[PDB]
Write a protein that binds this ligand. Structure first.
Ligand code: NAI
Ligand code: FMN
Ligand code: SF4
Ligand code: SF4
Ligand code: SF4
Ligand code: SF4
Ligand code: FES
Ligand code: FES
Ligand code: MG
Lengths: 230, 43, 217, 59, 433
């Protein structure tokens, strides 16, 4: 009907209008790297890890926020895309703390895995790192803000899914921080989901702290009985 | 006619509220604003 | 370099939610006029001018002022906190009666702005982050004020004092602390962005309404 | 470089070095290390169980 | 003799901003004396298509700094209405170091800007105009409000502006100290009560802009020349400058010159002629010239060897690898620490980044630290290539163009003064063992 044709690495894909580059790529089983894009949240475009090269276009596009156009040839594995990924990962890791052995995210970290899969293997950062002070947002979610990569996933979830506008950013540039700007507990019936959505160890479960590693656990799939939602 | 003097001397008599006083004065010259059909995006 | 100001608020006896703040009736009328400048469904657009008005009435912005603005505009307080922390013209701490801001950007810096900075520091006895113990002068460094042609330039209480030499800023400080209002602008007999001598352009008289209007109009 | 009987070490202040990252447990080819951990009374990340089966260890 | 090949001397009758130095009354009376607000009704009754055609044939390019063709940009907003209102947003942030033109335009003859707002709104079919003036420009904003009040009382704007039967309002909105708010999308976000963070494109402001309505963001200098272009026609304006570099321009010359000033001159004027004519020449003679930044901090610096014949337009300066930008000339003589000036510019950009996107937020601070170390000389020569690669990574990978404006100055410095950095590192190494 109104489907248009686009090419992902020379393979023709028929997609609905308004489909983004990331969605067109995943129509053929290719997952684009991401940090700020969540499919159940508003598009942000801030991380810049999803940049890919469109054929015959000098500038890379953000796959998470750019609608595909007819006749486009995405190139998910070209030199420009790989170099963009490496540069973005380098910038992400420049100020990140050497916290992996004490971080609860270790072993199931998107930053770690995507550094291993799309970044470089060494550093050329020769300065001192930043360090921000910690926040208290209740007895459920542990906060270690130095690990924050400024994805803004928690703010969007709080505003759109939980309906609570207590989370935001203060300051600008390097100094910008995520929090409440005052001592206020982010208390909600869905508050614990910000731990899952946060890709790093910035937000973690406080009852779970230091007790296990992901490769140790055995996974059992079952149903919740604490209400009638199931 | 002459290019002798400077004509921007008045701004020397500007106080803290001059801009907002001018806005208040101009509020009676505007046209009715359009409306989005709501009171807020959260209504 | 480093900012020096924190972006986390901790409650203080001088700055807490129960600190007294309220707009005067005249300021309430001004707020009404400000709000009536935007479409009816978008009243959050008035956050910036109303916050600035609260600062102009109070001198700075306590957390109570931010909460008051958020309540007046029916906006969540976190958005007002975001706006107050993002923009550098907002004072989340008390300042002096005169806020002396000196541009240290390259165009200003090339024409000896360090002389102006050191003259102010020597005349007041405070550094670029401190306040006079009389609590009437405050000195900071700002980026570019848009008046690069006149350098070095200093802005005090929303007034520009341009073409400065150390003596010029010294006498400006003297007559400011003497209860007088120094003349804003340059201090080299130039009073504009004109060349310092000669008036190399716009010497012929300007012409009238229909000088070169095209035909068929 | 000789490899002998195992030991756990301290910092010069007397605080333990081990932080319960479980990298040694993960890498051990004989599955000879068993570890449990929880936040200490002062909030430190420390172990409550650190067992090495020396009849499983290949040294 | 058609197709002029030597430019750089236009007399007063061909100048637009005849009250640039504020020597005549800026109150409506002076504007009418100078031809301001003349025959605006007839132009308004010519329709939007005629105004768009005049702007197109005049070849005018955006004076904000990007040089985008104004006619196509203003015709982007020429669609049938779908219910949402349409707006014109005039940019008056003026955050680029070295730039002072918009300040003078606003303070000394604001009626030109008001009438430009009217004619642009008519052309774009915009309901009202929002003028986002820099917060530090309190007096300029007050003068603009006084001119707006005079226009409202005189019937030039508002209900039935002139006799055209067209309704149009002008509003002045002040920022609070943020250079990033000059970017069009960040400016729109700042108008709507949010942080001045740019939004991605697409969508463009012509489709989803201020309040989600179709809008166009235009520099105040671009807006203020449209009425005179309509009055004198597209051809008169298109005669000046080279092909695709038409018109005249305001120039700011600051730095190490005897008489820094702001003048109006034809576009393609050579840099040397402008400097030695309007600025009184470089301090200590032309042989004392070290480098010149042609178009503000975001444009790469060029050495003295290039300022002997280079022209002041978009194309020639692009071929010189330096760009025209906002036509803000910063002059640095041979007594200038060239590393210190670029480091100060990078510190400015580090203090002005909005923090939204990873490349700017992290790499600009990284470059600032590296340049601060370069000034002393602690680094090694390999760090020069490292810094080049860092700038390359930042450029083209950011949401907005502030990453470009941070990366380009260090690229120019490394391109043209690498021996200075190398010898400074050598001196530091030999001094500190
Ligand atoms: N006036 C001042 O003080 C300052 C000026 N600048 C200058 O701003 C320049 C970069 O500005 P940008 O807006 O980021 O460049 P840009 O090329 O992306 O945009 C320029 C104009 O063209 C429009 N445009 C571009 N492509 C379009 C398209 N495909 N469809 C519809 N409209 C389109 C844009 O809406 C915009 O208004 C810099 O080179 C800098 O020199 C920077 C800082 C301050
Ligand atoms: C960081 C940044 C700051 C900017 N600041 C201004 C500014 O202060 N004034 C301005 O007119 N344009 C500024 N611009 C460029 C705007 O995009 C420009 O005003 C807009 O495109 C208007 O287009 P025009 O040049 O055709 O008028 C800035 C751009 C960037 C990236
Ligand atoms: S969140 Fe950071 S510190 Fe924690 S495991 Fe991942 S990369 Fe390491
Ligand atoms: S806390 Fe987590 S989700 Fe929130 S901004 Fe930081 S990294 Fe993103
Ligand atoms: S768990 Fe093992 S690897 Fe980790 S710190 Fe303790 S002894 Fe070392
Ligand atoms: S490039 Fe810098 S200023 Fe522009 S959006 Fe990204 S972080 Fe903000
Ligand atoms: S996933 Fe697209 S910019 Fe973050
Ligand atoms: S450099 Fe001082 S006003 Fe711009
Ligand atoms: Mg997490």
């Amino acid at each position: 009907s109104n489907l248009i044709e686009v090419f992902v690495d020379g393979q023709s894909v028929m997609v609905e209008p308004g489909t983004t580059v990331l969605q067109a790529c995943e129509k053929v089983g290719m997952q684009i790297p991401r940090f700020c894009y969540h499919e159940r949240l508003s598009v942000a475009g801030n991380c810049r890890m999803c940049l890919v090269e469109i054929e015959k276009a000098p500038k890379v596009v953000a796959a998470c926020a750019m609608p595909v156009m007819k006749g486009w040839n995405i190139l998910t594995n070209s030199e420009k895309s790989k170099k963009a990924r490496e540069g973005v990962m380098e910038f992400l890791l420049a100020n990140h703390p050497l916290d992996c052995p004490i971080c609860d995210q270790g072993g199931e970290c998107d930053l770690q895995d995507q550094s291993m899969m799309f970044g470089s293997d060494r550093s050329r950062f020769l300065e001192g790192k930043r360090a921000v002070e910690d926040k208290n947002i209740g007895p459920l979610v542990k906060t270690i803000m130095t690990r924050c990569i400024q994805c803004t996933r928690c703010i969007r979830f709080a505003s759109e899914i939980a309906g609570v506008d207590d989370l935001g950013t203060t300051g600008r540039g390097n100094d910008m921080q995520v929090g409440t700007y005052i001592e206020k507990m982010f208390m909600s019936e869905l508050s614990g989901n910000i731990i899952d959505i946060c890709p790093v160890g910035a937000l973690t479960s406080k009852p779970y702290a230091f007790t296990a590693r992901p490769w140790e656990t055995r996974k059992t799939e079952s149903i919740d009985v604490m209400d009638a939602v199931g | 006619f002459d290019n002798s003097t400077y004509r921007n001397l008045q701004h020397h008599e500007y106080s803290t509220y001059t801009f907002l006083d001018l806005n208040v004065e101009l509020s009676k010259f505007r046209m009715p604003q359009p409306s989005s059909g709501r009171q807020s995006p959260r209504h | 370099g480093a900012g020096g100001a924190l972006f986390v608020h901790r409650d203080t006896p001088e700055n807490n939610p129960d600190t007294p703040f309220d707009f005067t009736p005249e300021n309430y009328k001004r707020i009404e006029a400000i709000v009536k400048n935007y479409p009816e469904g978008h009243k959050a657009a008035a956050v910036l001018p109303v916050l600035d008005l609260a600062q102009r009435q109070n001198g700075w912005l306590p957390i109570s002022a931010m909460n008051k603005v958020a309540e007046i505009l029916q906006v969540p307080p976190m958005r007002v906190y975001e706006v107050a922390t993002f923009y550098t013209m907002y004072n989340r701490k008390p300042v002096g009666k005169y806020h002396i801001q000196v541009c240290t950007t390259t165009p200003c810096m090339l024409r000896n702005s360090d002389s102006i900075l050191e003259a102010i520091q020597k005349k007041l006895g405070i550094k670029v982050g401190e306040t006079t113990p009389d609590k009437l002068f405050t000195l900071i460094e700002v980026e570019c004020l848009g008046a690069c042609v006149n350098a070095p330039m200093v802005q005090i209480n929303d007034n520009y004092y341009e073409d400065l030499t150390p003596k010029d800023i010294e006498e400006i400080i003297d007559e400011l602390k003497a209860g007088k209002i120094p003349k804003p602008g340059p201090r080299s007999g130039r009073f504009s962005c004109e060349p310092a001598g000669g008036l190399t352009s716009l010497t012929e008289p300007p012409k009238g309404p229909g000088f070169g209007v095209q035909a068929g109009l | 470089r000789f490899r002998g009987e195992h030991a756990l070490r301290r910092y010069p202040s007397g605080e333990e070095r081990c932080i319960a990252c479980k990298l040694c447990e993960a890498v051990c080819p004989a599955q000879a290390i068993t570890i449990e951990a929880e936040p200490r009374a002062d909030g430190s990340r420390r172990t409550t169980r650190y067992d090495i089966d020396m009849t499983k260890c290949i040294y | 003799a058609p197709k002029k090949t030597s430019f750089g001397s236009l007399k007063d009758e061909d100048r637009i901003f005849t009250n640039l130095y504020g020597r005549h009354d800026w109150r409506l009376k002076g504007a009418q004396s100078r031809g301001d607000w003349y025959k605006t009704k007839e132009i308004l009754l010519k329709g939007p298509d005629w105004i768009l055609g005049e702007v197109k044939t005049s070849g005018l390019r955006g004076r904000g700094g990007a040089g985008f063709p104004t006619g196509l940009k203003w015709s982007f907003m020429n669609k049938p209405s779908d219910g949402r209102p349409k707006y014109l947003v005039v940019n008056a942030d003026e955050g680029e170091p070295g730039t002072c033109k918009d300040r003078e335009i606003i303070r000394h003859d604001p009626h030109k800007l008001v009438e430009g707002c009217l004619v642009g709104g008519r052309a774009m079919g915009a309901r009202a105009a929002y003028i986002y003036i820099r917060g530090e420009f309190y007096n300029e904003a007050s003068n603009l409000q006084v001119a707006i009040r005079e226009a409202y009382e005189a019937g030039l704007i508002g209900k039935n502006a002139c006799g055209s039967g067209y309704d149009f309002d002008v509003f002045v909105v002040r920022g609070a100290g943020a250079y990033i708010c000059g970017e069009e999308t960040a400016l729109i976000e700042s108008i709507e009560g949010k942080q001045g963070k740019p939004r991605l494109k697409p969508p463009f402001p012509a489709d989803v802009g201020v309040f989600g309505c179709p809008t166009t963001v235009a520099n105040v200098e671009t807006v203020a020349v449209s009425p005179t272009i309509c009055r004198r026609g597209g051809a008169w304006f298109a005669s000046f400058g080279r092909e695709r570099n038409s018109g005249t321009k305001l120039f700011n010359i600051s730095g190490h010159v005897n008489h820094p000033c702001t003048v109006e001159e034809e576009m393609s004027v050579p840099l040397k002629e402008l400097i030695e004519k309007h600025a009184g020449g470089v301090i200590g003679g032309w042989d004392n010239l070290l480098a010149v930044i042609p178009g503000g901090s975001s444009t790469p610096l060029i050495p003295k060897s290039v300022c002997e014949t280079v022209l002041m337009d978009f194309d020639a300066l692009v071929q010189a690898q330096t760009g025209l930008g906002t036509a803000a000339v910063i002059v640095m003589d041979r007594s200038t620490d060239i590393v210190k000036a670029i480091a100060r510019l990078i510190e400015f950009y580090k203090h002005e980044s909005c923090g939204q996107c990873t490349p700017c937020r992290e790499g600009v601070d990284w470059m600032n630290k590296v340049m601060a170390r370069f000034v002393k000389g602690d680094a090694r020569p390999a760090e020069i290539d490292s810094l080049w690669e860092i700038s390359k990574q930042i450029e083209g990978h950011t949401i907005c163009a502030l990453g470009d404006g941070a990366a380009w100055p260090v690229q120019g410095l490394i391109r043209h003064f690498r021996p200075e950095l190398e010898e400074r590192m050598q001196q530091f190494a030999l001094q500190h063992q």
